[PDB]
Design a protein around this nucleic acid. Structure first.
Lengths: 589, 317, 589, 160
RNA sequence: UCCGCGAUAGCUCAGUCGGUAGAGCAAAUGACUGUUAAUCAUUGGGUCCCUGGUUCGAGUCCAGGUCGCGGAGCCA
RNA sequence: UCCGCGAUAGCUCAGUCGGUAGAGCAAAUGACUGUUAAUCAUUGGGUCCCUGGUUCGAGUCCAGGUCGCGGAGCCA
């Protein structure tokens, strides 16, 4: 029976006695006065002991770290020289009337103090005491509040929280499925879903007008620092709605969520086309905090002797883009070399540059080794176009389209953070208007998402020229990271056949890989479209956490597994035989 | 892989009186109603061998073309179990009734293969334990019932061949009129001594004796599922142990009832109560004249002299 | 752009025009008037077409079954002789101004609503059009309402929605774990959780005061009817709370849920001890709708000539209980034989009986073949005790305790439903005070639930006589079915060692089986207790559904495979090789 | 065995290094090797197709690849399946065996004596001079370090 | 092993003491102004669970298999 | 195979051109009446990554192994 939480002890409760239960953070022994920092779910509070009651004192000196105790006392308004700024409850104390040690505690492996640099393997091995630390707890509690808000919104807007099965049927093409051997069907396997895509579509076919689900997803691809094997996703699918309605509801959701939790407001989300995004940022997920923008200038440089420019300038299969960085003329050649090697890592032969100091003094006014091979007029209209004035530097990327987009896009974000140019605010956006196809190494055309995405044109304008076709797909981006995305699907027979012919796949594969789906699609599927969010990254952003493991209760390491529970583990031969399998090594013919 | 198996078949002979007692054979739900003083192993009581029992024994011996010994002695198989009254099972250790015969089994893969039968002696049955309250209940109604243990030579290989042998035995016994053949009532039972070996190496997997096998389907499936199990066991290496296994048709798995820690010493010795029975060539001379026409040779006689197909000849015979 | 839902057309919207999108249920063609039954998530509505706009008529004649259409028209108030009881909107119609076919539909395999003779396999194979049926949809939507209410309650009461990982470490003893071959750790496996038990306990250790989660659970056992391999459970665990508080919050939740959704009220939940429940019902999950109760009477039938009573009456390991069924003396001998055979299936050697007709004449007032071996006095005080009067039948179960409890308990529920002797209201309850141990067939003692369950006594009264120990465990029962249950765990060193000592388990097994758990327990675990609900069965009860598959979106059959996606399926040898495992389906001669 | 193979590669490397024929540095890409590994169940000359693993660098790579190929062939013969002749390769990163080319048929390289180059005749006098020029073998020199000069096996070997 | 029942159009299900696979529903065409599980007429459709055998001829009869539900038997 | 760096108390991390594994933190005892990441004194604790060898003696030097990061090489 607790009266109040330690970290919710305001100044208003003075002259009242309280009972609070919790852990012993750290204990200060001065002899004549004993100090206890008691911690619970809500935070820390200070309890004071004077030896006028030596029994509670006896039950206070023995008390050590992380002891689970129950203290009843009175909330006293602390002296002026003792007030604590760091502690949220740090303007009050509690004089301990009676103390009781509910349970003793062995010495905690790592300390729960702030900024004690115990390292991550150890932090993972004892995660059950690591999550006791108020910062992690604040992050997880924040996650709960987030999912709460989202669930509330989606429920209030007539969406149905429906659960889809995890154990499903295996299939290639998309990604490696985690398999689960079947005891009852020897030689057969279940498979963990990568996304409730098919299930949500079936739910649209099933007549459910609006569906949402916070579902578990699993991918057997190799790992990285910000990627985990088991990740939670917010799946959403709707019927009888176009792209505007879906982006509307979802945007509204994000705003309402950000106001419910962090209390910030987002105005409106600008809708930027993919082509445009690629044009002035070189990325499908633009960071709208950085005002720096890429400007094309290849048109005035179509017949010049210098070849790293002229090369890609007359070849349609590439471009030459410029990037103005303001006030950065004072930059040393060293940093320039670092940046050249950086764009070097994305394949660029060189990062050309021009320092613009006095535009009115002409030729003797643009210091650069490249300026000699390029005419004054073109130069001047370039400077006119990019928006440059006194004090700026203009960099030049001249190569294949992909290369200049990635290299200048990254150089852009890099020098964006490196020079502290962005204002550190939230910056949301929508990326729309993707292309329908891209080529696939060997040849031919392929959809960069799924062949079931609805194109904006008709199946005739589509079979005319597939390269000019844009898709009805959409991604949501925050701080240059992709929070999620989806698209409106095709339910048209002739359209599905158009994209099917144009993708080069005959009815054999159509039947073998998506046959049951097409079947379900044939029996009267409504106009439906959807989207999915990576909940983990969303919470990671909303907390301001560095890694995804900071927003997951019990995460796994980069090599798939958690060191705390020692998973994955070994299983006895009996259960192995009963599931009709034997183990081995890796190689087989 | 080469799978060498064996078969130990217990056949319940259709005689009116028991092998050593005077009680009836076929019984109903009434317990202990078919048990006199002899079957209950009362102190001072003595057994006397049945006539038609040994008659049918040497009859099967003549039908199977086996060298029948002139003399055969009953030995004692001393083991302690509530179903066994006198503490020993009256069987035959040395000099059985019939020994070394051969049976032609007809399969579906062309040739009708010849199989070996090492012996076929006279045994006696015991009581039955039932599921009840607590304690348990033993019924000696089937105790004292004459049994014929046809042991086959380990010449039998594949599982389908084994099913063929059980069916051939069943058919021959049906023709001779020795046992009912009806496995449902519990007349005809069998065990399988299956042991697999990789071709080339004289080393091999441990022997597996699967006991209590009912239907032919059960035989096939259990033998297969045991063979593959042994194959896995030898492939992995592990621990090759000799065990007494069982098969349940519900899960198609093989479970071990008892692990054979050591060779059971039953302490065999010639029974002092029973004198060696002497079968003279005159008995066999009359009984061979009494011998009916074998079915396996009957369908072939339906092939040779009478115009007929293999199918119609077999199903008619 | 939909205006209103079909199944939400009240009489009040008359004189308003509406646009509604949906499926074409069935179509009636009369020539001069065309009738369309349009169906959505909310239900069916009728749209009428007159050829005064023969263009819409042209768009009415082509329309077939399950066509996805959008119709705009005006709601006209139908004649008194045309009103439809079956249709919730069936007192109004809508005259079709303009129609548009959003998508065409192939003929739906099976018809909606009875007596369309679909069989369960076909209904499962085409589950995506089966859920179009308004009844199934109502069930699932109801489920959504349930999870909504529960989440609202638990959120409002300071519980944290935290997600626990699915891929964990395998371990024996409890049940067969579904295994997942590890690509990164050859020879090792992940395991699907049976319950977030261990994780929730770690979460208690982690300082989170109150936890809840609606989690997926997986059991690789052979299954029963109303049992599925993948089932959803409402996990709950709290810190610094005793059993009264937990049962309080949880009971409050169930009441609030039943009033939010079905709008029924539960008064208060009676707390019944395990011992009492076994005494007067012979079951750990009593059906409090049936007033019929088992009454013990073996003490007065000790030294009696009749031997099937006196036998177990002097045997401590059993009892002789009587069961009065009122007004049932008119029951025919056929039914009696049926019931004897029924109680036969639970192991009872015989079902003794007494038909009670005339009490003032004594023995010649009790027609029965048993009455002769039992004295008149004992008879009279028996009849006095059981509450029997003129016209009744008294049954007798006389055997081992387990057998009589189960057989008479089941006879009780059976004859309870067969004679309609129950009140049709909802009847909830709590089962508390379980025993701590039981014998394990061969001998010795063992804990029924878990060795971590808190006993009501002290580790001394516990090490005294373990048989007299009651556990602090609790199950919640509704309509004789177990909705769920849990208990408060042990966090005491000496207590954990006491139960550990009393069960025969040395430190080898303590370390091998529970080492990581005990480890987590040693570093300062608080007083915590919990409970879990089988959400599926709860929804099954709340809907009134016959089976659990009726409250699951895409269920699986009794052999763990689902016929719709044909899972589990076969996987190519490549994916089999990459996961470091082999098959064993080899050709035999 | 694989350990024998590693020992053989080490012996070749040592002897050639002593002869001063090759540098021996596998890192520079001087000494390379291929392995024609083929297993067969004892008793039957049947089964067990040959597997040629090409491009093997370090001794560790040799050992690991040979083992992981032996067990692979063992499994392939256990399952039966399709035992096909291919030229495989080994990557130390995943310790898996990859197929570079599928052998559709026996490659006909068309061998015949080169008409521009005449056969070189090495007389026993050449060998007589070179035998005198022959350095002392390490394998026998360490054993000579054991026999005549007082020394242990270890220090004699590492000295040789 | 044994007893009973069952496998036949998209769905359900009938079919004698052996002679073009019918009926309801659904589908297609046509008719009809109040149905609401519409009706009526007409049209289209299928490998009678697999194999072999019998007969002039097979859903039907013989023999041997496969699968679903339940019962019996066995479980020294 | 080769190059660089690294393995040392519960945690972090140092250790020369070879002489009992030290220090911060944590732990234990004791002191001190206002700290709040308390301090101070004292005590306890650890296979210097494994094996073998060198020496009077090994964290240190020699040879051969195990593991983590990056680079080089090879990929007819």
């Amino acid at each position: 029976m607790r009266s109040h939480y330690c970290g919710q002890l305001n100044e208003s409760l003075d002259g009242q006695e309280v009972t609070l239960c919790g852990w012993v953070h750290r204990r200060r022994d001065h002899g004549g006065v004993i100090f206890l920092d008691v911690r619970d779910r809500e935070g820390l509070a200070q309890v004071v002991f004077d030896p006028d009651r030596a029994e509670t004192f006896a039950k206070a000196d023995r008390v050590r770290s992380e002891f689970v105790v129950k203290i009843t006392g009175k909330v006293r308004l602390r002296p002026e020289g003792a007030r604590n700024p760091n502690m949220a409850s740090g303007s009050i104390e509690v004089l301990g009337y009676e103390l009781e040690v509910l349970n003793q505690a062995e010495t905690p492996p790592f300390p729960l103090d702030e900024y004690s640099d115990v390292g991550e393997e150890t932090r993972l091995r004892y995660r059950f005491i690591d999550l006791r630390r108020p910062e992690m707890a604040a992050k997880l509690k924040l996650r709960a509040r987030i999912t709460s808000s989202i669930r509330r919104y989606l429920d209030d807007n007539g969406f149905l929280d429906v659960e889809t099965p995890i154990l499903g049927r295996p299939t290639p093409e998309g990604a490696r499925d985690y398999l689960v051997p079947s005891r009852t069907y020897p030689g057969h396997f279940f498979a963990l879903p990568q996304s409730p895509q098919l299930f949500k579509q079936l739910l649209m076919v099933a007549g459910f007008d609006r569906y949402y689900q916070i579902a578990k997803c699993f991918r057997d691809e190799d790992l990285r620092a910000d990627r985990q094997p088991e990740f939670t996703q917010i799946d959403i699918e709707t019927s009888f709605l176009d792209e505007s309605d879906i982006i509307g509801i979802t945007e509204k959701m994000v705003r309402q969520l950000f106001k419910e939790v962090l209390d910030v407001e987002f105005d409106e989300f600008p809708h930027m086309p993919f082509e445009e995004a690629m044009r002035r940022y070189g990325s499908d997920k633009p960071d709208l905090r950085i005002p720096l923008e890429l400007v094309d200038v290849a048109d005035q440089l179509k017949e010049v002797e210098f070849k790293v420019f002229s090369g890609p300038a007359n070849d349609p299969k590439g471009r030459v883009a410029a990037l103005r960085v303001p006030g950065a003329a004072s930059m040393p050649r060293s940093q320039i070399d670092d940046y050249t090697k950086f764009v070097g890592i994305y394949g660029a032969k060189g990062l050309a540059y021009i320092k613009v100091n006095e535009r009115a003094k002409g030729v003797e006014g643009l210091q650069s080794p490249i300026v000699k091979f390029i005419p004054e007029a073109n130069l001047n209209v370039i400077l006119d176009r990019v928006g440059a004035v006194d004090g700026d530097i203009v960099f030049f990327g001249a190569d294949k389209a992909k290369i200049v987009c990635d290299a200048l896009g990254a150089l852009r974000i890099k020098v964006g953070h490196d020079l502290k140019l962005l204002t550190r605010e939230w910056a949301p956006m929508w990326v729309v208007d993707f292309p329908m196809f891209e080529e696939n190494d060997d040849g031919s055309l392929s959809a960069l998402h799924h062949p079931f995405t609805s194109p904006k044109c008709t199946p005739a304008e589509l079979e005319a020229n597939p390269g000019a076709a844009l898709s009805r797909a959409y991604d949501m981006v925050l701080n240059g990271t992709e929070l999620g995305g989806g698209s409106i699907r095709i339910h048209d027979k002739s359209m599905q056949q158009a994209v099917f012919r144009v993708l080069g796949i005959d009815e054999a594969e159509q039947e073998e890989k998506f046959g049951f789906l097409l079947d379900a699609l044939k029996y009267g599927a409504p106009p439906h479209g959807g989207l999915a969010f990576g909940l983990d990254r969303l919470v990671m952003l909303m907390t301001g956490a560095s890694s995804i493991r900071e927003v997951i209760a019990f995460p796994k390491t980069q090599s798939a597994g958690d060191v705390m529970t020692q998973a994955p583990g070994s299983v006895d031969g009996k259960a192995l035989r009963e599931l009709h399998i034997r183990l081995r090594e890796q190689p087989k013919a | 892989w080469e799978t060498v198996i064996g078969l130990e078949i217990h056949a319940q002979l259709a005689t009116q009186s028991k092998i050593f007692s005077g009680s009836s054979t076929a019984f109903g739900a009434a317990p202990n109603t078919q048990a006199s003083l002899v079957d209950l192993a009362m102190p001072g009581t003595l057994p006397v061998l049945n006539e038609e029992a040994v008659r049918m024994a040497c009859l099967f011996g003549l039908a199977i073309d086996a060298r029948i010994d002139r003399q055969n002695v009953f030995a004692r198989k001393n083991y302690f179990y509530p179903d066994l009254p006198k503490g020993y099972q009256t069987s035959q250790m040395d000099h059985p009734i019939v020994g070394k015969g051969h049976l032609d089994i007809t399969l579906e893969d062309g040739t009708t293969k010849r199989i070996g039968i090492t012996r076929a002696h006279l045994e006696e049955d015991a009581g039955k334990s039932l599921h009840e309250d607590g304690m348990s209940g033993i019924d000696l109604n089937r105790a004292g019932t004459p049994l014929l243990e046809i042991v086959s030579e380990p010449d039998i290989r594949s599982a389908k061949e084994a099913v063929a042998y059980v069916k051939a035995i069943h058919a021959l016994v049906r023709y001779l009129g020795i046992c009912d053949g009806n496995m449902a009532e519990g007349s005809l039972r069998c065990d399988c001594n299956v042991s697999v070996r990789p071709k080339g190496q004289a080393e091999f997997g441990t022997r597996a004796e699967i006991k209590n096998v009912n239907s032919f389907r059960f035989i096939e499936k259990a033998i297969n599922h045991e063979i593959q199990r042994q194959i896995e066991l030898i492939e992995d290496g592990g621990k090759v142990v000799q065990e007494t296994r069982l098969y349940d048709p519900n899960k198609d798995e093989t479970r071990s009832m008892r692990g054979k820690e050591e060779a059971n010493d039953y302490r065999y010795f010639p029974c002092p109560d029973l004198l060696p029975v002497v079968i003279e060539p005159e008995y066999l001379a009359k009984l061979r004249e009494q011998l009916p026409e074998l079915p396996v040779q009957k369908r072939e006689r339906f092939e040779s002299q009478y115009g007929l197909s293999a199918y119609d000849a077999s199903v008619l015979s």
